[PDB]
Design a protein around this nucleic acid. Sequence first.
DNA 1: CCGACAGCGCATCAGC
DNA 2: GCTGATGCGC
DNA 3: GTCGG
Length: 326
Amino acid sequence: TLNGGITDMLTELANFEKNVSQAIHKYNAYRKAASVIAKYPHKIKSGAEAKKLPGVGTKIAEKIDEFLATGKLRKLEKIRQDDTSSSINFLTRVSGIGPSAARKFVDEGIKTLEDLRKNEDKLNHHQRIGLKYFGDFEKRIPREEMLQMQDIVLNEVKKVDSEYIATVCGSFRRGAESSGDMDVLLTHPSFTSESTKQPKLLHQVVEQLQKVHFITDTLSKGETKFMGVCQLPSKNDEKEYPHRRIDIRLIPKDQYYCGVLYFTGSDIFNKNMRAHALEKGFTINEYTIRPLGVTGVAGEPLPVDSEKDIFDYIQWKYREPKDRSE
DNA sequence: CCGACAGCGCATCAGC
DNA sequence: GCTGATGCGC
DNA sequence: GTCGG
Ligand SMILES: Cc1cn([C@H]2C[C@H](O)[C@@H](COP(=O)(O)C(F)(F)P(=O)(O)OP(=O)(O)O)O2)c(=O)[nH]c1=O
Ligand SMILES: [Cl-]
Ligand SMILES: [Cl-]
Ligand SMILES: [Mg+2]
Ligand SMILES: [Mg+2]
Ligand code: NA
Ligand code: NA
């Protein structure tokens, strides 16, 4: 927040480029510039001081000078006036609705929260749940509740099979005081990169969490990734907790460190680490870190026994989770 | 100037 | 039904 | 939109 007014602007621009313009790279340009400025330990005094940072070019430098002088951006003031942009930007806030679907609905006069409700018949299952819990999903989750959710999950998983290991990652693992949602990494000995000595591994867990009314709805579900909704139980007379989004990822147990690195984030951090790895002749995904052959082809998985080992390969000092929030 | 920009799971569609 | 592309999400 | 080469 030291430079909150500039990062907000940039984030607003990034949102415009992704949702409205469908220009994914401009989106990431802004997001990176926002990220790099957010960690600058000084109160930026000009766009030139900002251009010194990597990711901030001429254009963003001008926009920053404009913002520093007036306290706003003409481009955004205008963008805020345009009804289509206002609408499309808003519809994308429903989980399941992206830039494409947003622009489509608008082409049908469906541009408000109310228009969606009366037109629920035109939503796929995901967008339906998104709309249903639109309010709740915008709320943040206090670490204290996160801690309660962790308990329920770890204990319920334990009851399905003592060999399951559930790790809450995301901003939670990064030490955040509040989280947008709960991200859960799941491993079991019966599922490695070598074999799936047992099916329904993920299913049985979703099943158990649904049975104890923790999981309330499903957005999507596969053999390795679950995307849904959950809710903490409330006390007698106690007002209900907001519903919460929950992601669960089953990863081969011999690939845990690459998997936990991935899920811990942040998303920008992973982008930067993965890009940096490429520059060092490596490629990293949630499963492994392979070498890039002379021809670019990804080699075989490199032995990994800790998060740090991965960091070593790309010659990066180990950074704790709490320092990966970019 | 110019190509790269991280990597992948799930739902859904088109074409077969 | 499949594969492969696309949209949307992590 | 920004970057390395
Ligand atoms: C969105 C996304 C996510 N990730 C990885 C890192 C996140 O920590 C992790 C969790 O995905 P996420 O979508 O839950 C998150 F990024 F928002 P998170 O960092 O948890 O913050 P919060 O939800 O706002 O509390 O998944 C990527 O690698 N790329 C992406 O584009
Ligand atoms: Cl690993
Ligand atoms: Cl792999
Ligand atoms: Mg999260
Ligand atoms: Mg998540
Ligand atoms: Na720069
Ligand atoms: Na959306």
